[PDB]
Write a protein that binds this ligand. Structure first.
Ligand SMILES: O=c1cc[nH]c(=O)[nH]1
Ligand SMILES: O=c1cc[nH]c(=O)[nH]1
Lengths: 201, 202
C-alpha cells in the first residue's frame, strides 16, 4: 500500500526530529503522534512502543548508509565502486546529519537498543561483503588492506563531517552544504582512500 | 609550579572524567566528583569554580593528549614516519582512554556548546600552522598532493572510530583494541591506507 508507506514515513520523520531534539527518554509517543498528523492508536499499530520507533528510525538511516555496499558485485571495478560509495556516504552526511548524530549517540551509550541489529543483520552483510572485497584483494584488483578495516575507514571519514560538524566548521569555516567545500571533501577523502588501496607495481 | 598541587588537580580531573562519562554533564553533581576523588567539595572548588569549568578542563586535557604529537611536528621531520607515530599514538589513546574519546564526541554531538571557544581559537590556530607545514612538505615533494586539513580530519576520524563506535566494531569483528593481535592489525591497516594514500609515488 502507498498509504501505509506514506504514513510510516511521516511517523519516522516526525520521530527522527523528536528524538533528535529531546533524546530517547524525554520523548513521548503522543508528541510524535502530534507532529506526524496521526492518532496514537494509529501510530501504535505500526510501532508498538517508543523502543520500536527508535529502533526503526535507526534502521532507516542504516538502510540508506548501506545501500551502496549492498549493491557491490564481484564484477564491479573495485576502485570505481569504492569511490562512488564514498561519494554517496558524504551526500548522506550533508542531507541527513540529524540521523547520523542520532546513530552516533546510540553507539556512545553502548548501543543498548541497537545491538540486535549490529550483531545480526548488519554483521551478516559485512561478512558477505568482506568476503567479496577479500576476493578483489586475493586477485590483485586491490592492494592488501583488510576489508573490515577499509569499511570502517569509509564509515568513519564520511560520518565525521556530520557528527563532528562543529569542529569542521570551526577549523575550516565551512559545512557540507557549501557546494565548493563539499566537492573538495569528496575528492580529498576519495584520493587518500583510493590511492591507499590501489594495486602497486 | 607545585607538583603536589598538580597531582591533586589531575586526581580531580580524572574523577570528573569518569563521573561525567557515567552520568552525563547535567546529571553529574559536584558532590559526586569530590567524593570519588577522595576530597572535600571545598577543596574541589578551590581549583575549579564550577561544574562547567571542570567539564571544560576535562575536555581540554584530552585535547592536549590528542594533539601533542601534532604540536611536535617540525618542518625537518620525515613526514611519513611522523604520521605513522601520530596514527599509532591516536590508536593507543583510543584503547587506553575510550571514556575521554566518547565524552568529547558527545560534546560535539550537542553542537559544542561549552567547548566552541577552544575549537575556534587554539585548535584552529594549530591546524592553520601545521596545515601550512604539511603544504610545505607537499611543495617540497615529500608527500603526494593532498589537502592538509582533510588528511588531519581523516587521521582523527579513523582512529577515534574504534573508541566511539567500539560496540559496532566488536559486533562485526568480535574484538576490541585491548586484544593485542587486533590492535596490531588495526594499526597496520589504518597506517597502510593513509600512508600509501599520501606517499609521493613518482
Ligand atoms: O555506513 C555505515 C553503516 C553501518 N554503521 C556505520 O557506522 N556507518
Ligand atoms: O585528535 C583530535 C584533535 C582534535 N579534535 C578531534 O576530534 N581529534
Amino acid at each position: 500500500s502507498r498509504a501505509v508507506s506514506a504514513k510510516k514515513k511521516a511517523i519516522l520523520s516526525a520521530a527522527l526530529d523528536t528524538f533528535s531534539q529531546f533524546g530517547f527518554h524525554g520523548t513521548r509517543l503522543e508528541q510524535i503522534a502530534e507532529l506526524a498528523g496521526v492518532s496514537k492508536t494509529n501510530l501504535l499499530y505500526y510501532f508498538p512502543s517508543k523502543e520500536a520507533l527508535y529502533i526503526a528510525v535507526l534502521r532507516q538511516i542504516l538502510d540508506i548508509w548501506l545501500a551502496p555496499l549492498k549493491a557491490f558485485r564481484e564484477d564491479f571495478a573495485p576502485l570505481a565502486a569504492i569511490k562512488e560509495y564514498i561519494r554517496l556516504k558524504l551526500e548522506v552526511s550533508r542531507d541527513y546529519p540529524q540521523a547520523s548524530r542520532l546513530f552516533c549517540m546510540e553507539m556512545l551509550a553502548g548501543a543498548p537498543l541497537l545491538m540486535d541489529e549490529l550483531t545480526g543483520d548488519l554483521k551478516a552483510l559485512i561478512d558477505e561483503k568482506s568476503a567479496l572485497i577479500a576476493g578483489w584483494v586475493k586477485s590483485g584488483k586491490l592492494a592488501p588492506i583488510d576489508p573490515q578495516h577499509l569499511i570502517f575507514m569509509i564509515w568513519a571519514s564520511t560520518q565525521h563531517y556530520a557528527d563532528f560538524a562543529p569542529q569542521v566548521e570551526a577549523v575550516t569555516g565551512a559545512t557540507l552544504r557549501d557546494e565548493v567545500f563539499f566537492n573538495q571533501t569528496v575528492e580529498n577523502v576519495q584520493r587518500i582512500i583510493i590511492e591507499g588501496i590501489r594495486p602497486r607495481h
